[PDB]
Write a protein that holds these residues in place. Structure first.
Motif, PDB file in Angstrom:
ATOM      1  N   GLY A  37       0.770  -1.223   0.000  1.00 54.10           N
ATOM      2  CA  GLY A  37       0.000   0.000   0.000  1.00 54.10           C
ATOM      3  C   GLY A  37       0.807   1.283   0.000  1.00 54.10           C
ATOM      4  O   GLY A  37       0.224   2.362   0.147  1.00 54.10           O
ATOM      5  N   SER A  38       2.126   1.215  -0.180  1.00 50.48           N
ATOM      6  CA  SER A  38       2.946   2.417  -0.317  1.00 50.48           C
ATOM      7  C   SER A  38       4.145   2.084  -1.189  1.00 50.48           C
ATOM      8  O   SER A  38       4.366   0.930  -1.558  1.00 50.48           O
ATOM      9  CB  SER A  38       3.361   2.992   1.042  1.00 50.48           C
ATOM     10  N   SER A  39       4.958   3.104  -1.480  1.00 56.17           N
ATOM     11  CA  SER A  39       5.939   2.952  -2.550  1.00 56.17           C
ATOM     12  C   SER A  39       7.296   3.546  -2.193  1.00 56.17           C
ATOM     13  O   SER A  39       8.098   3.846  -3.095  1.00 56.17           O
ATOM     14  CB  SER A  39       5.383   3.562  -3.829  1.00 56.17           C
ATOM     15  N   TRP A  75      12.469  13.135   1.129  1.00 54.54           N
ATOM     16  CA  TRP A  75      11.227  12.388   1.115  1.00 54.54           C
ATOM     17  C   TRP A  75      10.471  12.667   2.403  1.00 54.54           C
ATOM     18  O   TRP A  75      11.045  13.064   3.423  1.00 54.54           O
ATOM     19  CB  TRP A  75      11.482  10.889   0.983  1.00 54.54           C
ATOM     20  N   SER A  76       9.162  12.472   2.326  1.00 49.19           N
ATOM     21  CA  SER A  76       8.280  12.720   3.460  1.00 49.19           C
ATOM     22  C   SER A  76       6.962  12.017   3.183  1.00 49.19           C
ATOM     23  O   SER A  76       6.344  12.236   2.129  1.00 49.19           O
ATOM     24  CB  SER A  76       8.040  14.222   3.651  1.00 49.19           C
ATOM     25  N   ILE A  77       6.543  11.164   4.115  1.00 52.88           N
ATOM     26  CA  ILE A  77       5.367  10.334   3.898  1.00 52.88           C
ATOM     27  C   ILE A  77       4.507  10.337   5.149  1.00 52.88           C
ATOM     28  O   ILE A  77       5.022  10.384   6.273  1.00 52.88           O
ATOM     29  CB  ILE A  77       5.789   8.911   3.468  1.00 52.88           C
ATOM     30  N   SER A  78       3.190  10.325   4.943  1.00 54.56           N
ATOM     31  CA  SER A  78       2.210  10.201   6.016  1.00 54.56           C
ATOM     32  C   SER A  78       1.269   9.069   5.652  1.00 54.56           C
ATOM     33  O   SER A  78       0.724   9.045   4.543  1.00 54.56           O
ATOM     34  CB  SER A  78       1.400  11.486   6.176  1.00 54.56           C
ATOM     35  N   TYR A  79       1.093   8.133   6.569  1.00 56.80           N
ATOM     36  CA  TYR A  79       0.324   6.925   6.315  1.00 56.80           C
ATOM     37  C   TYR A  79      -1.101   7.063   6.855  1.00 56.80           C
ATOM     38  O   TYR A  79      -1.420   7.965   7.633  1.00 56.80           O
ATOM     39  CB  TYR A  79       1.022   5.723   6.944  1.00 56.80           C
ATOM     40  N   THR A 132       4.433   5.475  -8.961  1.00 53.40           N
ATOM     41  CA  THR A 132       3.821   6.791  -9.029  1.00 53.40           C
ATOM     42  C   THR A 132       3.481   7.355  -7.654  1.00 53.40           C
ATOM     43  O   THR A 132       3.250   8.562  -7.550  1.00 53.40           O
ATOM     44  CB  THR A 132       2.557   6.742  -9.883  1.00 53.40           C
ATOM     45  N   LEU A 133       3.434   6.529  -6.597  1.00 48.42           N
ATOM     46  CA  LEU A 133       3.194   7.043  -5.248  1.00 48.42           C
ATOM     47  C   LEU A 133       4.468   7.361  -4.479  1.00 48.42           C
ATOM     48  O   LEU A 133       4.381   7.856  -3.349  1.00 48.42           O
ATOM     49  CB  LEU A 133       2.374   6.048  -4.418  1.00 48.42           C
ATOM     50  N   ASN A 134       5.643   7.121  -5.047  1.00 49.18           N
ATOM     51  CA  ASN A 134       6.862   7.350  -4.297  1.00 49.18           C
ATOM     52  C   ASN A 134       7.000   8.838  -3.995  1.00 49.18           C
ATOM     53  O   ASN A 134       6.725   9.682  -4.860  1.00 49.18           O
ATOM     54  CB  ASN A 134       8.055   6.845  -5.103  1.00 49.18           C
ATOM     55  N   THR A 135       7.446   9.166  -2.773  1.00 51.90           N
ATOM     56  CA  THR A 135       7.441  10.554  -2.315  1.00 51.90           C
ATOM     57  C   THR A 135       8.750  11.297  -2.535  1.00 51.90           C
ATOM     58  O   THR A 135       8.830  12.473  -2.172  1.00 51.90           O
ATOM     59  CB  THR A 135       7.056  10.704  -0.828  1.00 51.90           C
ATOM     60  N   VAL A 136       9.767  10.673  -3.116  1.00 54.17           N
ATOM     61  CA  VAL A 136      11.047  11.366  -3.253  1.00 54.17           C
ATOM     62  C   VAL A 136      10.902  12.558  -4.185  1.00 54.17           C
ATOM     63  O   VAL A 136      10.313  12.463  -5.268  1.00 54.17           O
ATOM     64  CB  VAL A 136      12.149  10.410  -3.723  1.00 54.17           C
ATOM     65  N   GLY A 193      -2.524   4.533  -7.850  1.00 55.61           N
ATOM     66  CA  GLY A 193      -1.221   4.038  -7.454  1.00 55.61           C
ATOM     67  C   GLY A 193      -1.227   2.765  -6.638  1.00 55.61           C
ATOM     68  O   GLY A 193      -0.150   2.294  -6.252  1.00 55.61           O
ATOM     69  N   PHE A 194      -2.381   2.181  -6.384  1.00 57.33           N
ATOM     70  CA  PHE A 194      -2.510   1.017  -5.522  1.00 57.33           C
ATOM     71  C   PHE A 194      -2.818  -0.222  -6.351  1.00 57.33           C
ATOM     72  O   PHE A 194      -3.192  -0.146  -7.520  1.00 57.33           O
ATOM     73  CB  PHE A 194      -3.675   1.191  -4.532  1.00 57.33           C
ATOM     74  N   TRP A 195      -2.720  -1.382  -5.698  1.00 56.29           N
ATOM     75  CA  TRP A 195      -3.205  -2.646  -6.253  1.00 56.29           C
ATOM     76  C   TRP A 195      -4.702  -2.695  -5.968  1.00 56.29           C
ATOM     77  O   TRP A 195      -5.178  -3.353  -5.031  1.00 56.29           O
ATOM     78  CB  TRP A 195      -2.459  -3.830  -5.641  1.00 56.29           C
TER      79      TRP A 195
HETATM   80  N1  LIG Z   1       2.718  12.173   0.324  1.00 57.20           N
HETATM   81  C1  LIG Z   1       2.296  11.317   1.341  1.00 57.20           C
HETATM   82  O1  LIG Z   1       2.259  11.777   2.487  1.00 57.20           O
HETATM   83  C2  LIG Z   1       1.911   9.943   1.102  1.00 57.20           C
HETATM   84  C3  LIG Z   1       2.044   9.193  -0.077  1.00 57.20           C
HETATM   85  C4  LIG Z   1       1.521   7.880   0.185  1.00 57.20           C
HETATM   86  C5  LIG Z   1       1.383   6.729  -0.587  1.00 57.20           C
HETATM   87  C6  LIG Z   1       0.823   5.600  -0.024  1.00 57.20           C
HETATM   88  C7  LIG Z   1       0.384   5.587   1.309  1.00 57.20           C
HETATM   89  C8  LIG Z   1       0.496   6.704   2.098  1.00 57.20           C
HETATM   90  C9  LIG Z   1       1.067   7.859   1.530  1.00 57.20           C
HETATM   91  N2  LIG Z   1       1.319   9.117   2.060  1.00 57.20           N
END
Ligand SMILES: NC(=O)c1cc2ccccc2[nH]1
Length: 330
Positions: A37-39, A75-79, A132-136, A193-195
């Motif tokens: 569920g994330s990349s 990079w910066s991600i929030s789940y 396509t979901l990668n945050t870099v 961007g998900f399965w």
């Molecule tokens: N930009 C984000 O904070 C972000 C991207 C993403 C992709 C999958 C699951 C959670 C996610 N958060």
């Protein structure tokens, strides 16, 4: 090429699964949460704020002769559970179960939120959704699977999660000894961007199957099964004393109960989740109220076929030019 690695529950509830991953030269082995569920592939590191590290194994890029700073990249991600992490980026050699990618983006955490700090068993995440979901930023990076795909014997990986037991992630081949019957394949939308796929319906226990389309995502990084409120209400109505608790944050049930199974449709095929898989134990130590493994998606915006559902199946993530998902009983 192929790879094969054992994945192990982090605790007695199967809250998540960790898989050993070799990073750098000489190898530094970290236990990562493989997350369809994330990349982003990110790790606790020598750069992580010291007060935010509590027992995790860290990646130290300065000790790897193949590590290179990816200049300017962050990079910066929030789940979906409210957790988060951020940092900078190296490229390095990454190997999973004998399968090696050179030049993989390894995202080094400078900051992690409290839930990551508090979980000493997870050293980072390895994302397996679409790149396509990668945050870099400013240059988006590819997942480990996307980088390995051209080298694989077949452009697939499989998830075989155990119930209270180890399981397996394979890359590049389908182990025909690992499932019963046949694999039923179903269409995937990559638009978010998900399965993302559409289940054909559900049944509760020995009840009749209800044909209804349920769009959702196959997400190894989510513990529970999140479905529409109508479906979840129908399930918990079969459990004496079950109720939705706003104070707890979901459906709870008496720990003395025997739970019914839950069946979901994959095309004309059916995957049965045994009732015991839906028991997530006391809400707090010593309580006789137990937390349910099927919960409403109403506040999320998407249905999530998390570990509760996926561990009842052998699951094929088919990354062919037109991706698909396959499910078999096991
Ligand atoms: N930009 C984000 O904070 C972000 C991207 C993403 C992709 C999958 C699951 C959670 C996610 N958060």
């Amino acid at each position: 090429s192929t790879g094969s690695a054992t994945t192990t529950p982090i605790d007695s509830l199967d809250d998540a699964y960790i898989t050993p991953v070799q990073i750098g030269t000489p190898a530094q082995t970290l236990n990562l949460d493989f997350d369809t569920g994330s990349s982003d592939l990110w790790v606790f590191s020598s750069e992580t704020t010291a007060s935010e590290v509590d027992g995790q194994t860290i990646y130290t890029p300065s000790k790897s002769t193949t590590a290179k700073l990816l200049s300017g990249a962050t990079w910066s991600i929030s789940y979906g559970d409210g957790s988060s992490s951020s940092g900078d980026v190296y490229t390095d050699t990454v190997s999973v179960g004998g399968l090696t990618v050179t030049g993989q983006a390894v995202e080094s955490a400078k900051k992690v939120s409290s839930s990551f700090t508090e979980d000493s068993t997870i050293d980072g995440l390895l994302g397996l959704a679409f790149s396509t979901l990668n945050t870099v930023s400013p240059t988006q990076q590819k997942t480990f699977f996307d980088n390995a795909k051209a080298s694989l014997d077949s452009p697939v990986f499989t998830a075989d999660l155990g119930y209270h037991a180890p399981g397996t992630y394979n890359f590049g081949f389908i182990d025909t000894t690992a499932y019963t019957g046949s694999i039923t394949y179903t269409a995937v939308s990559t638009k978010q961007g998900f399965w993302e796929w559409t289940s054909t319906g559900y049944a509760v226990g020995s009840g009749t199957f209800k044909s209804t389309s349920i769009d959702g995502i196959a997400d190894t990084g989510t513990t529970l099964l999140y479905l529409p409120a109508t479906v979840v209400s129908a399930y918990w109505a079969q459990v004496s004393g079950a109720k939705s608790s706003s104070s707890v944050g979901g459906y709870v049930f008496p720990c003395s109960a025997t739970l019914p199974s839950f069946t979901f449709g994959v095309g004309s095929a059916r995957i049965v989740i045994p009732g015991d898989y839906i028991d997530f134990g006391p809400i707090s130590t010593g309580s006789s109220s137990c937390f349910g493994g099927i919960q409403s998606s109403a506040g999320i915006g998407i249905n999530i076929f998390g570990d509760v559902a996926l561990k009842a199946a052998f699951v094929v993530f088919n990354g062919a030019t037109t991706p698909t998902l396959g499910f078999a009983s096991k």
